[PDB]
Design a protein around this ligand. Structure first.
Ligand SMILES: N[C@H]1CC[C@H](Nc2cncc(-c3cccc(/C=C/C(=O)O)c3)n2)CC1
Length: 274
């Protein structure tokens, strides 16, 4: 019934993907996020295992649903005449990573390492469940501030993971790889790695490396902030122009810059004041 189940709070954020509100489950006072998505704006429609038409985003969220805290959990969903309403997990207190970096600037490498590791674990969880996120970026990462735990959100641009070529894309252009800009052709995992390179640069420098198509295509990385040689190496590897020159996930997590990660709780205690 929705109205009798949730008390709607203030708008957390909005866009083409939808409008996300703070909410509370009236049942047990659980903090939730209530995301509204217009039907007219859904491009990718999905198949439920029982044969009901839902947005692909619902398909993908159910597929990644788990006790694993690295990916946002879908709690319920509703269909309305003109929209879908998604009830999502909400950590409290929380801060979106984009806002975190906007406030604090370039992150210390120990913190970036902890954050980047957790994103890698979350993205590996998605792929292992057959889900390609397609919009990995700071804005789509929430920080559980008490626990030091990160959560991937916004599966509205995602697709089922396949090993064949993707010829469609509606994620964030400044995180999209050169093969998409030039050819309108990418493969899931190597494009994901590219976006991860953009993200890591963003963490350690406080902003993204490329603004224009010409820059993405050239792939020349300039460091505006002091960044260790190992981190620079990892970033430049992720941002290899040829998709096949990019590291696998295993290679990223075995990289020397990635050793001795802090646990999330240690991360909270040292860097999040907790
Ligand atoms: N692309 C979106 C735009 C709204 C942004 N705003 C915020 C800010 N603070 C918290 C949240 C939030 C809290 C709980 C769940 C979610 C999930 C959103 C989603 O899956 O789309 C999002 N969302 C998040 C990224």
């Amino acid at each position: 019934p929705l109205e009798s189940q949730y008390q709607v709070g203030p708008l957390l954020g909005s866009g083409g993907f939808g409008s996300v509100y703070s909410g509370i489950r009236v049942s047990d006072n659980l903090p939730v996020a209530i995301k509204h998505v217009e039907k007219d704006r859904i491009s990718d429609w999905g198949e439920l295992p029982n044969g009901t038409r839902v947005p692909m985003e619902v398909v993908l969220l159910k597929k990644v649903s788990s006790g694993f805290s690295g990916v946002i959990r879908l709690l319920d969903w509703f269909e309305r005449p003109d929209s879908f309403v998604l009830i999502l997990e909400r950590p409290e207190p929380v801060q979106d990573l984009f806002d975190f970096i906007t406030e604090r600037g370039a992150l210390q490498e120990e913190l970036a390492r902890s954050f980047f590791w957790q994103v890698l674990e979350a993205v590996r969880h998605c792929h292992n469940c057959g889900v390609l996120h397609r919009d990995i970026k700071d804005e789509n990462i929430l920080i559980d501030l008490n626990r030091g735990e990160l959560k991937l959100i916004d599966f509205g641009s995602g697709a089922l993971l396949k090993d064949t070529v993707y010829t469609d894309f509606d994620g964030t252009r400044v995180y999209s790889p050169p093969e998409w800009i030039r050819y309108h052709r990418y493969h899931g995992r190597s494009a994901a790695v590219w976006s991860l390179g953009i993200l890591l640069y963003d963490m350690v420098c406080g902003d993204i490396p490329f603004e224009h198509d010409e820059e993405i295509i050239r792939g020349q990385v300039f460091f505006r902030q002091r960044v260790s040689s190992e981190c620079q190496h990892l970033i430049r590897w992720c941002l290899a122009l040829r998709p096949s020159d990019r590291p696998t996930f295993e290679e990223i997590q075995n990289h020397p810059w990635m050793q001795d990660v802090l646990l999330p709780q240690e991360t909270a205690e040292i860097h999040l004041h907790s």
